[PDB]
Design a protein around this ligand. Structure first.
Ligand SMILES: N[C@@H](CCC(=O)N[C@@H](CS)C(=O)NCC(=O)O)C(=O)O
Ligand SMILES: N[C@@H](CCC(=O)N[C@@H](CS)C(=O)NCC(=O)O)C(=O)O
Ligand code: NA
Ligand code: NA
Lengths: 320, 321
């Protein structure tokens, strides 16, 4: 398998993304896509083509997402998809990096459910969840462990889950916490909804590729680690051109300005592949802020997804 | 058609590339018995597979022969304070299954011989020993160039040579990964006279290194690592794991293979109780850390970056789910 060569030859990247989740991957009226995971797709396209528009988006629901990657319909799956051992071992898939560390939570309507302030008060609740998710299984674990009753209402379409929760048919919504922010913004009265404090699982969102093509996994992995290194070194969409002439050898090396460097070409890309990425989408923090952080209606704090040296878990492996 | 797992089970032991001799990480005694942080990681993989942490043979490798030994098939895995970098990921036919220790490059001096020095920025002109075939050598050049310091490296082929030249005073300073400086220092004539300066000049994530093209084998190494992390997070130890197997906690039951009709271990190519085998063999991540390089060792390194993710560090066990 040589996915990179195939991608170069067709001139665009085919990406599996969400059907519609605000902040992460959502289309406008014209079918134009934006979001955190979308920008990660555009980052890979930027690394390869120097053009973040060279992407074709395939929206996938929770049940069809893995099949679409296995069959080669999409080249990469970037779609709030949790890295787990069973997905790593039993599906013929690998993970090239974690672009967002999350965890599972519960959301309620505070006007309808007065006095509920903890997930441990939800015994008896009807709770909507989607089939084909970690979410369904973790909820079962949590309620069993805490000796609570519950009525799972299982959906195949996110639109149906959203509707059943918003109508009051379901008392609570469960999914990844960052997704609850996005779901909330699509409801009738977003301000009425409270994400409860409990986080009941680890949900590291993975950059998902097929096994058996290390060169392709390398390209995806190092696009991610380039976004991280760029933010750590203060390299932005706005200054990256200027940063090519930096005195800092780390920065010079990252941006392909070093004498006889072979980093980009060993990866199968051009020497200035990181310049292309950062011009295309900015660094990791810029992607975060415009889509799900302070530059967005979601206002999610960096938290676990801060840089490693600022208290977070996001650690750019060295471009060395 | 590569299948290292099958070949490992067929020959009946695991062949591991390790250090020639670095206290705390990988060191043989007089009888050729091995111990250390990276050594225990090797034994963890052996326990996952064979249920016996001694079903392993060790291949000592200097900085220059370590990648060749893995590429050639002479060793099945390389666990040897080896930094994950893009060039090692893209140009050698190798992959990395995980990061078992986040480190960074530092400098060590004899504070008795070099009094008045408290910063690496005061090292202009100093003779500094370093090994060939390392990230270390390249980063030092970068650091001295960037900071306009006079650059006087002394490059060695073997660690014993570097250690002797530094201790004898032929070199003014020693540079390598900070955790390694702790280990080197313990081998010197008077360990107490040596100070590790505050500056950290690089990222050095130590990686579990395997050949590309064998996903099944990479999964085994990767998930040995993450099992070690998850077990520590869940308070599962060498001493209590047999008891924890009877836990009502669903996460623990699933991790330790006590769930009904679970397929986690067998999908990995191992037995259902593969994590119980690991923890019985070597204990959890924290136990490996403490006995070798932490407060239960002469090195006394703080967890720091290698603390659990929910205790202020970077070490994050991917869910066994
Ligand atoms: N991270 C979890 C949940 C992923 C997931 O699919 N979440 C839902 C709820 S936010 C979603 O994205 N639905 C969109 C769709 O299925 O079309 C997993 O990997 O199983
Ligand atoms: N982490 C650095 C340095 C690794 C390294 O080889 N360090 C030396 C100095 S502590 C070592 O292990 N020497 C033992 C030997 O070469 O036999 C790298 O991967 O390049
Ligand atoms: Na895999
Ligand atoms: Na690789």
């Amino acid at each position: 398998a040589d996915t990179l060569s195939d991608v170069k030859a067709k001139g665009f990247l085919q990406c599996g993304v969400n059907t519609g989740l605000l902040g992460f991957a959502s289309p406008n009226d014209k079918g134009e896509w934006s979001g955190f995971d979308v920008d990660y797709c555009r980052a890979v396209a930027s690394a390869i083509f120097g053009d973040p528009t060279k992407v074709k988006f395939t929206p996938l629901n929770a049940k069809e997402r893995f099949t679409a990657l296995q069959s080669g319909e999409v080249d990469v799956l970037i779609r709030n998809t949790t890295w787990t051992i069973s997905r790593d071992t039993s599906l013929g898939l690998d993970f090239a990096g974690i672009n967002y560390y999350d965890g599972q939570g519960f959301m309620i309507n505070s006007k309808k459910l007065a006095g509920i302030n903890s997930a441990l008060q939800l015994s008896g609740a009807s709770i909507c969840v989607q089939a084909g998710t970690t979410t369904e299984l973790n909820m079962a674990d949590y309620f069993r462990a805490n000796k609570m009753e519950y009525n799972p209402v299982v959906f195949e379409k996110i639109e149906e889950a959203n509707a059943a929760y918003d109508s009051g048919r379901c008392d609570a919504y469960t999914t990844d916490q960052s997704s609850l922010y996005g779901v909330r913004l699509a409801l009738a009265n977003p301000d009425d909804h409270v994400i409860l404090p409990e986080i009941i699982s680890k949900e590291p969102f993975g950059l998902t590729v097929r096994q058996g093509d290390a060169r392709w996994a390398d390209v995806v992995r190092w696009t991610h680690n380039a976004l991280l290194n760029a933010e750590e070194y203060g390299i932005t969409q706005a200054n990256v051109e200027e940063m090519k002439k930096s005195d800092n050898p780390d920065i010079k090396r990252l941006l392909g300005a070093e004498a006889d460097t072979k980093i980009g070409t060993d990866l199968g890309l051009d020497k200035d592949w990181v310049v292309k990425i950062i011009k295309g989408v900015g660094n990791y923090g810029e992607i975060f802020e415009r889509n799900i952080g302070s530059g967005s209606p979601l206002k999610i704090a960096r938290g676990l997804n801060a840089q490693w040296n600022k208290g977070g878990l996001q650690y750019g492996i060295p471009v060395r």
